[PDB]
Copies of this chain bind each other. A is one copy, B any other.
């Protein structure tokens, strides 16, 4: 029951800081649960991290896919545009601090059940990019290229905050619309 509060509280803290930086004791208080209640739902920190990544996958994929299904009658450039714009909104959102899946691999949060979630999600996004570009109306720029560019656009602004990714994306949208 209080599982969701814990999950949602840990998600924010992991996104805000890092996995190794926030310990279980901090998640306990901020969720306002008893230690015993935490471990009933999450017997270990790795299990909470696994559920945090599963939740991030479910929310990202549902969000993207729902926008695209609003454009099934829009043609293929319109749907590719929406995938690109979605990234603009994602890095401009207030709490954006990078990609949580890239964060887990850099922090070596890579127990097998966690890695499979990470790889399955990024394999889904690679496939989605590839399917959106393998249309007749598209060319020049390859999908493996666009995928890695989007992945590089998900880096924390702190690495290079003068880079405006939205300006690059707006420019690439105009190329598809040539």
- Seen from chain A, the residues whose Cβ lies within 8 Å of a Cβ on chain B are 17-18, 20-21, 98, 101-103, 105-108, 110, 115, 118-119, 122-123, 126, 139-142, 144-145, 147-153, 155-156, 158-165, 167-168, 171-172, 175, 178
Contact = CB atoms under 8 A, between A and B. Distances in A.
A77 to B, nearest CB: 14
Contact of A122 (B110, B160, B168): B160
Contacts of A175: 140-141
Contact of A115 (B147, B148, B158): B158
Contacts of A160: 118-119, 122-123, 126
A119 B156 CA distance: 11
A142 B149 CA distance: 11
> Which 3 pairs from chain A and chain B are nearest by CB?
A152-B152, A151-B152, A148-B152
Contacts of A106: 18, 98, 102-103, 106-107, 156
A167 B150 contact: no
A107 B168 contact: no
A167 B142 CA distance: 10
Given A98-B106, A107-B106, A108-B18, A149 B156 contact: no
Contacts of A152: 147-153
